[PDB]
Design a protein around this motif. Structure first.
Motif, PDB file in Angstrom:
ATOM      1  N   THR A   1       6.120   8.448   2.521  1.00  0.00           N
ATOM      2  CA  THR A   1       5.958   9.816   2.036  1.00  0.00           C
ATOM      3  C   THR A   1       5.197   9.826   0.712  1.00  0.00           C
ATOM      4  O   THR A   1       5.516  10.582  -0.213  1.00  0.00           O
ATOM      5  CB  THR A   1       7.326  10.494   1.912  1.00  0.00           C
ATOM      6  N   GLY A   2       4.194   8.954   0.595  1.00  0.00           N
ATOM      7  CA  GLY A   2       3.398   8.872  -0.614  1.00  0.00           C
ATOM      8  C   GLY A   2       2.390  10.008  -0.708  1.00  0.00           C
ATOM      9  O   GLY A   2       2.495  11.037  -0.029  1.00  0.00           O
ATOM     10  N   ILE A   3       1.366   9.794  -1.541  1.00  0.00           N
ATOM     11  CA  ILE A   3       0.425  10.883  -1.839  1.00  0.00           C
ATOM     12  C   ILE A   3      -0.467  11.245  -0.653  1.00  0.00           C
ATOM     13  O   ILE A   3      -1.043  12.345  -0.631  1.00  0.00           O
ATOM     14  CB  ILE A   3      -0.409  10.512  -3.082  1.00  0.00           C
ATOM     15  N   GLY A   4      -0.593  10.367   0.340  1.00  0.00           N
ATOM     16  CA  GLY A   4      -1.429  10.656   1.497  1.00  0.00           C
ATOM     17  C   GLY A   4      -2.907  10.537   1.159  1.00  0.00           C
ATOM     18  O   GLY A   4      -3.294  10.110   0.074  1.00  0.00           O
ATOM     19  N   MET A   5      -3.746  10.915   2.123  1.00  0.00           N
ATOM     20  CA  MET A   5      -5.176  10.746   1.936  1.00  0.00           C
ATOM     21  C   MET A   5      -5.865  12.003   2.429  1.00  0.00           C
ATOM     22  O   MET A   5      -5.471  12.553   3.459  1.00  0.00           O
ATOM     23  CB  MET A   5      -5.712   9.541   2.740  1.00  0.00           C
ATOM     24  N   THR A   6      -6.902  12.445   1.711  1.00  0.00           N
ATOM     25  CA  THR A   6      -7.754  13.524   2.202  1.00  0.00           C
ATOM     26  C   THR A   6      -8.715  12.991   3.269  1.00  0.00           C
ATOM     27  O   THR A   6      -8.850  11.781   3.464  1.00  0.00           O
ATOM     28  CB  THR A   6      -8.579  14.106   1.070  1.00  0.00           C
TER      29      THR A   6
ATOM     30  N   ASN B   1       0.831  -1.198   0.000  1.00  0.00           N
ATOM     31  CA  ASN B   1       0.000   0.000   0.000  1.00  0.00           C
ATOM     32  C   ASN B   1       0.869   1.252   0.000  1.00  0.00           C
ATOM     33  O   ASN B   1       0.562   2.231  -0.693  1.00  0.00           O
ATOM     34  CB  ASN B   1      -0.908   0.016   1.233  1.00  0.00           C
ATOM     35  N   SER B   2       1.925   1.260   0.813  1.00  0.00           N
ATOM     36  CA  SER B   2       2.829   2.412   0.826  1.00  0.00           C
ATOM     37  C   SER B   2       3.485   2.603  -0.539  1.00  0.00           C
ATOM     38  O   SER B   2       3.572   3.725  -1.046  1.00  0.00           O
ATOM     39  CB  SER B   2       3.901   2.244   1.909  1.00  0.00           C
ATOM     40  N   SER B   3       3.955   1.515  -1.153  1.00  0.00           N
ATOM     41  CA  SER B   3       4.545   1.633  -2.484  1.00  0.00           C
ATOM     42  C   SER B   3       3.538   2.207  -3.484  1.00  0.00           C
ATOM     43  O   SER B   3       3.884   3.048  -4.321  1.00  0.00           O
ATOM     44  CB  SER B   3       5.045   0.258  -2.953  1.00  0.00           C
ATOM     45  N   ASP B   4       2.283   1.747  -3.425  1.00  0.00           N
ATOM     46  CA  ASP B   4       1.251   2.278  -4.311  1.00  0.00           C
ATOM     47  C   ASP B   4       1.065   3.786  -4.120  1.00  0.00           C
ATOM     48  O   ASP B   4       0.911   4.525  -5.101  1.00  0.00           O
ATOM     49  CB  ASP B   4      -0.081   1.548  -4.060  1.00  0.00           C
ATOM     50  N   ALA B   5       1.076   4.250  -2.863  1.00  0.00           N
ATOM     51  CA  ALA B   5       0.896   5.671  -2.558  1.00  0.00           C
ATOM     52  C   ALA B   5       2.090   6.487  -3.042  1.00  0.00           C
ATOM     53  O   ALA B   5       1.944   7.636  -3.487  1.00  0.00           O
ATOM     54  CB  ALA B   5       0.692   5.847  -1.047  1.00  0.00           C
ATOM     55  N   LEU B   6       3.288   5.917  -2.922  1.00  0.00           N
ATOM     56  CA  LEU B   6       4.485   6.569  -3.438  1.00  0.00           C
ATOM     57  C   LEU B   6       4.464   6.635  -4.958  1.00  0.00           C
ATOM     58  O   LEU B   6       4.846   7.653  -5.542  1.00  0.00           O
ATOM     59  CB  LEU B   6       5.722   5.816  -2.948  1.00  0.00           C
ATOM     60  N   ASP B   7       4.018   5.563  -5.624  1.00  0.00           N
ATOM     61  CA  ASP B   7       3.892   5.623  -7.079  1.00  0.00           C
ATOM     62  C   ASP B   7       2.991   6.783  -7.485  1.00  0.00           C
ATOM     63  O   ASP B   7       3.236   7.463  -8.493  1.00  0.00           O
ATOM     64  CB  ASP B   7       3.292   4.324  -7.626  1.00  0.00           C
ATOM     65  N   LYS B   8       1.894   6.973  -6.743  1.00  0.00           N
ATOM     66  CA  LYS B   8       0.916   7.990  -7.113  1.00  0.00           C
ATOM     67  C   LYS B   8       1.510   9.388  -7.054  1.00  0.00           C
ATOM     68  O   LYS B   8       1.334  10.182  -7.985  1.00  0.00           O
ATOM     69  CB  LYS B   8      -0.314   7.897  -6.203  1.00  0.00           C
ATOM     70  N   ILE B   9       2.191   9.726  -5.957  1.00  0.00           N
ATOM     71  CA  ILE B   9       2.772  11.069  -5.885  1.00  0.00           C
ATOM     72  C   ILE B   9       3.915  11.215  -6.887  1.00  0.00           C
ATOM     73  O   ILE B   9       4.101  12.298  -7.460  1.00  0.00           O
ATOM     74  CB  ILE B   9       3.212  11.431  -4.448  1.00  0.00           C
ATOM     75  N   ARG B  10       4.678  10.145  -7.150  1.00  0.00           N
ATOM     76  CA  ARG B  10       5.724  10.253  -8.169  1.00  0.00           C
ATOM     77  C   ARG B  10       5.124  10.580  -9.528  1.00  0.00           C
ATOM     78  O   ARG B  10       5.607  11.473 -10.229  1.00  0.00           O
ATOM     79  CB  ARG B  10       6.564   8.979  -8.268  1.00  0.00           C
ATOM     80  N   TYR B  11       4.042   9.887  -9.902  1.00  0.00           N
ATOM     81  CA  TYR B  11       3.409  10.136 -11.193  1.00  0.00           C
ATOM     82  C   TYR B  11       2.916  11.580 -11.295  1.00  0.00           C
ATOM     83  O   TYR B  11       3.126  12.253 -12.314  1.00  0.00           O
ATOM     84  CB  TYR B  11       2.245   9.156 -11.412  1.00  0.00           C
ATOM     85  N   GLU B  12       2.236  12.072 -10.251  1.00  0.00           N
ATOM     86  CA  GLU B  12       1.748  13.451 -10.275  1.00  0.00           C
ATOM     87  C   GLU B  12       2.905  14.430 -10.426  1.00  0.00           C
ATOM     88  O   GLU B  12       2.803  15.419 -11.156  1.00  0.00           O
ATOM     89  CB  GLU B  12       0.969  13.725  -8.992  1.00  0.00           C
ATOM     90  N   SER B  13       4.030  14.148  -9.767  1.00  0.00           N
ATOM     91  CA  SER B  13       5.170  15.055  -9.838  1.00  0.00           C
ATOM     92  C   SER B  13       5.811  15.069 -11.217  1.00  0.00           C
ATOM     93  O   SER B  13       6.577  15.991 -11.516  1.00  0.00           O
ATOM     94  CB  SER B  13       6.228  14.663  -8.806  1.00  0.00           C
TER      95      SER B  13
END
Ligand code: 6RO
Ligand code: 6RO
Length: 209
Positions: A79-84, A36-48
């Motif tokens: 340090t992934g994308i986090g959650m609202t 799950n952490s890796s998935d969240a990190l992938d997400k913020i990397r892609y946005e960046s």
């Protein structure tokens, strides 16, 4: 100011089944949370990739594992994308209703409990080892929040006045009394090497005094 919410019935059912079924292979919880952490990190990397200012809240993309024997907690920090806040309330950003249905359907068709992660609800395997889970999270588009649940049908959400995280998610596992092996350094290393050897982010296992 603490808001208390009922789990959807299907998610409550999934958690009681994780808590009450006999299943010895509890160590998969850590694989699921790291994934799950890796998935969240992938997400913020892609946005960046198209907006570098998305990393103004922290350039480093990593996963830390922090055992604390005095507190009897294992904390997984990314340090992934986090959650609202809306994400937290909506089953921590998962499609948990349909995922739970597909998981229990798969279990009818010969699937294993360790394949929980293939149905998008791997977070809830935390309750294999934890009596309480606290999730602290900060998304670029929202404030820092704390989600908490000891199962039993409800969870709470509050604004987090604790230590600012910048961006990401911290999963705090308040371990069951008979599950303290997951605070031991050699046990955590064994699990990470067995199940998470190819995760594409640095995983740092903190040591204790
Ligand atoms: C085999 S069952 O009744 O679905 N129980 C179950 C389901 C998921 C986990 Cl992680 C642990 C136990
Ligand atoms: C399995 S690996 O990524 O090659 N290295 C590793 C092994 C164990 C821990 Cl606790 C952290 C990192």
């Amino acid at each position: 100011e603490v808001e208390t919410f009922a789990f959807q019935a299907e998610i409550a059912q999934l958690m009681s089944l994780i808590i009450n079924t006999f299943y010895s292979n509890k160590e998969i919880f850590l694989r699921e949370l790291i994934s799950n952490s890796s998935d969240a990190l992938d997400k913020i990397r892609y946005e960046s990739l198209t907006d570098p200012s998305k990393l103004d809240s922290g350039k480093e993309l990593h996963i830390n594992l922090i055992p604390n024997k005095q507190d009897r907690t294992l904390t997984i920090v990314d340090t992934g994308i986090g959650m609202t806040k809306a994400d937290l309330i909506n089953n921590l950003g998962t499609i948990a209703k349909s995922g739970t249905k597909a998981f229990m359907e798969a279990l009818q068709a010969g699937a294993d409990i360790s394949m929980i992660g293939q149905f998008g609800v791997g977070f809830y395997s935390a309750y294999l080892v934890a009596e309480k889970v606290t999730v602290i999270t900060k998304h670029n588009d929202d404030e820092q929040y704390a989600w908490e649940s000891s199962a039993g049908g409800s969870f709470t959400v509050r604004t987090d006045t604790g230590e600012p995280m910048g961006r990401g998610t911290k999963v705090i596992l308040h371990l069951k009394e008979d599950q303290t092996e997951y605070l031991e350094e050699r046990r955590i290393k064994e699990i990470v090497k067995k199940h998470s050897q190819f995760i594409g982010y640095p995983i740092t296992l903190f040591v204790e005094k």
